[PDB]
Point group: D2
Chain length 336, copies 4
């Protein structure tokens, strides 16, 4: 039994999540999943009703929860996601980039998984103005975090095509990246097909032939950049799912923001959200080993690819003229 | 006048460069260009003939020279280029990304100019191992280096589409990138169309629509990555020219390596090299204000564009079947 | 005309300052000094009446004042002195160490002046925990601050024995202290008797023979340590005066704390306070060049040495049995 | 048993050391000490005889040796001592300050033991010039190095007056020194009389009353300064012994240099050297747990104390008029 904290959020969050509960229920039924969805408030509407973005009562329900399933948050996204990440130590940021039929009309065979270290590097904020016009920032990279991220890489590789590529820039940064690349090797080498690529080359190679990649393990920054590039190649950044996995707690969300310009027009695309749910199921299979959840993930992911291939009910963002309701219905019919 | 240190280099360097002298000579007399070319030896071949990769007699000549024109260098590339860039303070790294009609693009017509700070950031190698398994790098951003790179960005924009985009990550690095962006504004705001974009957005927008970009001004690291992504999108990395511009010294080279595997087969593509020469002429114009150099620049760029459009004598790297002598000849007929 | 902001402070501050106004008035009279003493509240009693240690009304009266003359502050000393230093940029911390008759029974001829840089080094607080069990602190030293501190050194040397000693540790810290020692030389060398000493040697030399020193210019930390040592040798740390001089604003105070254990017993020693007033007068001679204030400084300083030599009315801290009132009276009689 | 690499060194080194072998030999047979002395060449004299200051044949022997006993080294001191201290991880720098009855003290009887961390802090030389006239040093404090130095502090305290004082500056450096002090507490609190003192207070209290101190545990830099202050107070820097203790290698030397000005006059004082030997025996006791070494230590310390008390055969550096042979002889008669 898993307990999932459901967050609607702002903008098109409420429309996307609330209308997706139909699919979330059809799957608990069809595959007999013991998932409890207890929803809580967080974001810009919670800051207006109460005084905090992450209300006291909400934090207490998330703490007793296994997984956090959220839609997009507004202006307060930084106080909700970041603070929630460092207290439940959700170090691994997973970013899949898979070709979607119809949207990728250039390659068609992209299947990348980017494992990105999300705790150190330059994104921890240790910077100062040391003198007039002079700013110094500290890049901190440890072998502890470097091995933990690698282990996650190994787990995803082992159930995919057994191929990992450690991406870095150790030719210039001998010490920092050199340490990251060494810890990469201690874990991966000899257990999977291993190779190393320089960050600039990988940025060029993603364009030339992204099918050469399976799993990519890289650092916080390099990963921030390569992820977005990869998603856009696979088709669209507005369709991209995201996850932040820790040892005892995980978080699944879409990459796209709250999108206030289209909020309420009933045309927001629920695809990113729904693919993050597919990952969430996959995470319930690593924690339970009960293949009951893996079946639900494949079923939801193939339902999505089928609607995109037919082109009969897509939202405006991807060239359709159907609503969010029509798209969800098409996925609900091909579910079983 | 101008004095140029010419370096043939290794692998395909000797073939490419020596055969391109015909072209370098025809232009000097066609546009009455006072350029003196004095070749020096450097690279792997010089390490085996003499004792050093960069002989004292070579350094003596490059010291009096205005511009450094070079072909690809072998294994000792990292000891030459980098050193010369530091002692002659060649801070601006120019990387154009321009599609050539003829070669496969699959992204449309792109005309992007990336201007990269090439002296500070994380690439100055200020990093150490502080404790067991703990490494620390220092990122340095200064007002000085940042205004200087923005001024170079302004020059190039002004004679292109007058559009600039500062790429950074000030949302997460408030102090370091924030100082970069502020320097970018005090120089560019008001003088050109100016916008700022986060590096991960840019990595993605470069794939979604690269035609939205004209001149990009960014940091050492971010520019290192985006440069290679932009060159692939436009065409190939083997067609890509490069430049390193200082106040009183400039260097022009192809991006491609020595390519020992095809050396001597007489098939190395001189395009990247000849486009470097074209950039050189562009820099001689800024220095002398004599538009003869700009006319020589357009004349050379044009000639290669015509031969590519005709597709009758291309090299095998771009789908042709002609020799490196045939392609140079076709550019020589389109010149006069 | 000078306007001095008078602060009583806590503990023995109120007793020391308020009873010293007799001497402060006798000198304005005897030497016709145009000094306006307008007193303001700051410290632990101000935090109890109002809500801030440095009340809004107080800050506004200090801003229109030239010099700040304070007694000791209590628990809130860090929010009063430090914040007041960095907004009026009072970089130079002056610490004289002069033998007092009767208390120095070991050397008898100590006359040191320590000029201590008070803005950079390690005392600016740029430190983080980068990893588990690992802490990093940044030592930042600029040539700007290094030359400003040296210039102050030169001014004090020029009206004393024309002898300066730059103290550092550049043999180990080639870059940081090496830069400090270079900036020391640019200013001092060729204008005064110049020499360099290593910090550990100076710590030993102060004990062996402190008469070898006149003025000492050193960095924030080394100076924090050497100052206290020097004062204790000269006689007593509880007798030591202190100053923080800036370009447009100065601050004079005793080194000793509020001393709550003896507060109200009418036995606190006013000597430290009164010698800081002697420095304050000296500072009015650098800003006015009117030797009227220099006369008042020598007169107050000799009045103090005379009472210490006679031993008839000293406070318990230095072996007497007289009160703070009796000591002030003896100085008031030998004033004129 | 123990094997000792003996190094005569330069200047007065050869005279002092060679004449002290008589003493080293008499003790080995008087207390049945299994110590093998194997002399190696190192210093300026070795740089002129052979080619290196620290010959390969010397390093070979020191590698198999347990303890390194050395006399003063000339100009090449910084290349030997420092290197050997880094590759054999000799982290604890012991600096006793003990008055000898006979020599001028002027501070009473002091018996201070300073234990200095000698591997991290600011002395690992992690500093760079980041911008024009701006230098940055990195101060590194670790939990590991700090507990290790506190354990060494505990050993020495336990066999002295069971009193320890952690010297630091955590009031201003909250993070760095704060971590040092915390490591100091978890090891010392409860096992000995434990207090903490700020470095500037200590510099002053060392002059006011040094008898309040027994064992001092501090950092690399603070201990560098206070060590020299404490040795002067106790007596002289030329009488001061020094030690550098690692887990599997230890080094013992005098603090004084080679003193070329008096070399050959047969007047160099062997006290510092012989007190180093005494410390060595103390370390052999901790390693073997055989009190024969401790008896040899007290026996040697005592003999020198008797000759100093009698004042009949002292060297000119301490007011005597005897030769370096006479003083060694008097210690040899007081031994048997
Ligand atoms: Mg993030
Ligand atoms: Mg480069
Ligand atoms: Mg201070
Ligand atoms: Mg040392």
């Amino acid at each position: 039994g898993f307990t999932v904290a459901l967050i609607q959020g702002d903008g098109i969050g409420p429309e996307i999540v609330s209308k997706s509960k139909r699919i979330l229920a059809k799957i608990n039924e069809l595959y007999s999943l013991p998932i409890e969805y207890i929803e809580v408030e967080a974001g810009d509407r919670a800051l207006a009703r109460y005084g905090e973005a992450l209300p006291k009562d909400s934090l207490k329900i998330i703490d007793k929860a296994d997984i956090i399933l959220k839609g997009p948050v507004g202006e307060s996204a930084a106080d909700v996601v970041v603070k929630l990440r460092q207290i439940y130590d959700m170090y691994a940021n997973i970013r899949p980039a898979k070709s979607i039929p119809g949207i990728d009309t250039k390659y068609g065979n992209v299947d990348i998984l980017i494992v990105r270290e999300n705790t150190e590097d330059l994104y921890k904020g240790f910077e100062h103005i040391v003198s007039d016009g002079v700013a110094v920032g500290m890049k901190i990279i440890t072998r502890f975090a470097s091995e933990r991220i690698a282990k996650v890489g190994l787990n995803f590789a082992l159930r995919r095509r057994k191929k990992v590529t450690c991406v870095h820039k150790a030719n210039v940064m001998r010490i920092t990246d050199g340490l990251f690349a060494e810890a990469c090797r201690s874990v991966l080498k000899g257990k999977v097909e291993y190779s190393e690529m320089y960050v600039d080359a990988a940025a060029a190679n993603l364009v030339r032939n992204p099918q050469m990649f399976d799993v990519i393990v890289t650092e916080n920054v390099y990963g921030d950049i390569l992820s977005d590039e990869a998603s856009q190649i696979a088709g669209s950044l507005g369709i991209a799912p995201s996850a932040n996995i820790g040892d005892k707690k995980a978080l699944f969300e879409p990459v796209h923001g709250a999108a206030f310009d289209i909020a309420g027009k009933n045309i927001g695309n629920p695809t990113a959200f729904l693919l993050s749910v597919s990952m969430m199921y996959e995470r319930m299979y690593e924690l339970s080993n009960d293949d009951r959840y893996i079946k639900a993930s494949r079923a939801l992911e193939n339902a999505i690819y089928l609607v995109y291939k037919e082109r009969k009910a897509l939202t405006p963002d991807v060239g359709g003229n159907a609503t969010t309701d029509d798209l969800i219905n098409e996925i609900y019919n091909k579910l079983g």
